Symmetry: D2
Subunit: 141 residues, 4 copies
């Protein structure tokens, strides 16, 4: 009473809540993160590099790992960081600066462009990890 | 080619918005019995309005009483093609809420009033029987038009 | 450890059912003004019933008129702890729909009647003002109890 | 009119439709399928083996591939088939008959038990494919 009707709550409440929870889940995939292999390591062992979103969603954290992790990678421990605010664009495939030259690698390549003319270049280990980053970056941006 | 990780954004999310949208519209397909406005002595005092199953036309027609069963789309005299709708207005902005003489409405019914403007001179004027039917129509018409 | 492919079943699906559930319950938190039953000459002719924000207690109390603003939970005389509810009955199975004398209800209101049975002798008896409020209460009580 | 209210459609319509579409999506992941490497091939090349659900959801189809596919694998072309009706159980990890003996492989192992005491044993290529099969089999069963 005496105005308004729960008939409205499908559009006014249920719909935005569902969009929000799907948004949050696209972002939480990034918070969890991905371990990438250091492809040009020429160390005796395999070397790894981790990238993940901070818990408040405002900062990318990334850095070298001595081993592939079997659990959570604390973000503050990683060497490097990138304010999400400082991201200009995400580019994909042939558009990536490290891809100017191979059909399968192009499907896995993405780059984050930031600042002056800086770029954080990736080659995802598989198409699921690739989709996690590109979809999560779309949500973020 | 292309991971199932994408189907939250690309499949589940639009299919959920489509379900919600279709439900808002199907509430008008069911339709509503309205009190007839400017009804003379001895004329039918009700009329029914419902959206066609394909969501393309509003069917409507007078009724002698509030119906106990379903009123099929085809049995209603009149059609208003949805494409012909200019706008929906509510409350004080409805022509039937601007009557000055014997046709004036009680102000008590202001929160219940809406009109569909079509064809740059015409209205379908409504007074909802209640606030829930009001919301069915205004929310349903939002879905049919903008959102 | 453990893929994001699982979060359709394990995260999105339960969070959607929880949203829907919480909405059905929050419709009772808003509550409804009911017509007072067996009201004597000069007694308050309305009463309000609403669920506590934590969904644990039904608050209710008499009102002199149908309220224009919100009726806060705390201002209502009486509490019925949800845990104390045995059952919900409807229509012909409501005690107030079995009255034989001066307290009998018009049969027209049968589809609007429901009662909450509590404490193995007591009822809160309701006649919903309309079919939409009826559904708010019956659907809301289903969510509070079974589903 | 004159009975019922759209207030009911959250519980009676929206809720089951959403469960159904999520069900359908867990099953469609299987319809698309997964290419598995033939780990004990000792052919000159890599050999592959595909497994997928039929479009009507009633039959598993699987068989050897000469190459990793870059597209849709028609199900009728695959050598073998398994009525879903004939599936007794899905077992996981240490419970798998091919796992009686290695923490990372156990996380990827699953077996479909069918018929007499038959078993179709798998080692998923990655944790995403593993989850696609186990979640999809749960939906199916």
């Amino acid at each position: 009473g005496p105005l308004g009707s729960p008939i409205l709550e499908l559009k006014e409440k249920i719909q935005p809540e569902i969009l929000e929870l799907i948004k949050q889940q696209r972002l939480n995939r990034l918070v969890e993160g991905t371990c990438f292999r250091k492809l040009n390591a020429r160390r005796r062992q395999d070397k790894f590099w981790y990238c993940r979103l901070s818990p408040n969603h405002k900062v990318l954290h990334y850095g070298d790992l001595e081993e592939s992790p079997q659990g959570e990678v604390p973000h503050d421990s990683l060497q490097d960081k990138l304010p999400v605010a400082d991201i200009k664009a995400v580019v994909t495939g042939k558009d990536c600066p490290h891809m100017k030259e191979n059909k399968e690698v192009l499907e896995l390549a993405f780059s984050i462009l930031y600042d002056s003319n800086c770029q954080l270049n990736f080659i995802a280990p598989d198409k699921h990890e690739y989709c996690i980053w590109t979809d999560g970056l779309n949500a973020l941006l």
